[PDB]
């Protein structure tokens, strides 16, 4: 079974690459409040099958460029 | 028998036309040693009459305190005039671990193992009213089962 | 080369060797992969002097591992009856 993460596309205009932000729901170490943090990754897609603002599921692969180590798995909740 | 214990003697003034005229205030706490405790303030012109006037006020202002085997029932707080006082039951804490004017009121009540800490102002008059407000608000498991659960084996567990 | 050797711990004039499985390049008290027992040479005639987990030691020599002269001596010293 493959470790994989969800996340929404922030930008797509970079020629067979898209960037994806992952929101994790972490607790504060001191104060105990739950704070939304962000994990903007540069993920790889083949033929640009993703616009802006849609959920993309990704998994980790070999390094493909400088800060590109994730490829696409599928697309759910395609942008309207 | 009633464990008279003077805490502090102060010197207060009145400022009259001639000069300043002084008098003395005391603060003594009494108590049998099994859960009764009372403080009386008292003030007079000389020192031993100010302490003796505190003894008569302290005997007619005793309250009832519930203790389990010489220690408290539960962690309890007490607030009086900027004096926040915390006290723990301290299950064999082995000693009255309390500050000035908080230790003396706990010696005459008969309670022997407390971890106590006083926040805010540690004025000796106000911290004795803070502990006494903390001790009579403390309730025993017999009093809690009398109003909730209706069984002491079911209230505690 | 993994080696099963003695790392000298304990105080001055009171040595205590830990029978340990370490790479040969590392230091004596340095890194190791596993410890597999101890050896107390000054534990004289009282109740207990040495203990080695011989199943884990036989596992490492199956993977290929040289053993020191003392470790080979304590494995001999836990005899067939003693």
């Amino acid at each position: 079974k493959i470790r994989t993460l969800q996340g929404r596309v922030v930008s797509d205009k970079m020629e067979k690459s898209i960037v994806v932000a992952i929101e994790r729901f972490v607790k504060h170490p001191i104060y105990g409040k739950f704070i939304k943090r962000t994990t903007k990754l540069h993920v790889h897609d083949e033929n640009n099958e993703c616009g802006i603002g849609d959920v993309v599921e990704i998994r980790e692969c070999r390094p493909l460029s400088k800060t590109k180590s994730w490829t696409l798995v599928r697309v759910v909740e395609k942008a309207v | 028998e009633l464990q008279e214990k003077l805490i502090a003697v102060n010197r207060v003034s009145k400022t009259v036309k001639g000069g300043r005229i002084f008098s003395f205030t005391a603060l003594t706490v009494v108590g049998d040693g099994n859960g009764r405790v009372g403080f009386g303030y008292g003030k007079a012109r000389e020192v031993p009459a100010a302490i003796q006037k505190a003894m008569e006020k302290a005997r007619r202002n005793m309250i009832n305190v519930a203790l389990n085997n010489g220690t408290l029932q539960h962690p309890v707080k007490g607030v009086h005039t900027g004096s926040r006082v915390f006290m723990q039951p301290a299950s064999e804490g082995t000693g009255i671990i309390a500050g000035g004017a908080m230790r003396a009121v706990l010696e005459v009540a008969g309670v022997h193992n407390v971890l106590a800490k006083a926040y805010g102002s540690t004025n000796p008059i106000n911290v004795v009213r803070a502990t006494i407000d903390g001790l009579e608000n403390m309730n025993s498991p017999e009093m809690v089962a009398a109003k909730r659960g209706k069984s002491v084996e079911e209230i505690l567990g | 080369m993994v080696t099963i050797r003695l790392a000298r711990h304990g105080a001055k004039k009171r040595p205590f060797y830990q029978v340990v499985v370490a790479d040969s390049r590392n230091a004596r008290n340095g890194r190791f992969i596993e410890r597999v027992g101890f050896f107390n040479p000054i534990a004289s005639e009282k109740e207990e002097g040495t203990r080695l987990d011989l199943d884990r030691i036989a596992h490492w020599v199956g993977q290929g591992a040289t053993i020191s002269d003392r470790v080979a001596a304590l494995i001999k010293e836990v005899n067939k009856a003693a």
Partner: protein, 129 residues
């Protein structure tokens, strides 16, 4: 603007026992009924009943043992601004065990004593002293 209905329910009990009222009224909900059922089974309140179909309203008849009230103190622990979840070995005991802590666990809403014996924890809702 009405962001914690649970703390508003405990505030009505706290102000009802202070004003020596016979009963208190609040708009009912599923969580308000379930924690009031915990308050009735322990002995802090008696005889809760919901009245209404489309706008339900929950009644709580408050208890007074002596002239003093029964609910000595009641706090709201897991605020909406700060939610607090505790483990099995991390459930607190109020007043060294003679108070209750209402915990919402995965098997329903119960006390701290009933959730320690179940062997599971959750969001601690309130401390009823």
């Amino acid at each position: 603007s009405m962001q914690d209905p649970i703390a508003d329910m405990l505030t009505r009990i706290r102000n009802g026992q202070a004003a020596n009222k016979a009963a208190v009224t609040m708009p009912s909900s599923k969580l308000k009924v379930a924690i009031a059922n915990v308050l009735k089974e322990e002995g802090f309140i008696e005889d809760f009943k919901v009245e209404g179909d489309t706008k339900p309203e929950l009644e709580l008849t408050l208890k007074y043992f002596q002239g003093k009230a029964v609910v000595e103190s009641i706090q709201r622990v897991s605020r909406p601004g700060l939610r607090i979840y505790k483990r099995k070995d991390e459930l607190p005991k109020v007043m060294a065990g003679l108070g209750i802590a209402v915990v919402s666990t995965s098997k329903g809403v119960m006390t701290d004593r009933a959730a320690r014996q179940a062997g599971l924890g959750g969001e601690i809702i309130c401390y009823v002293a």
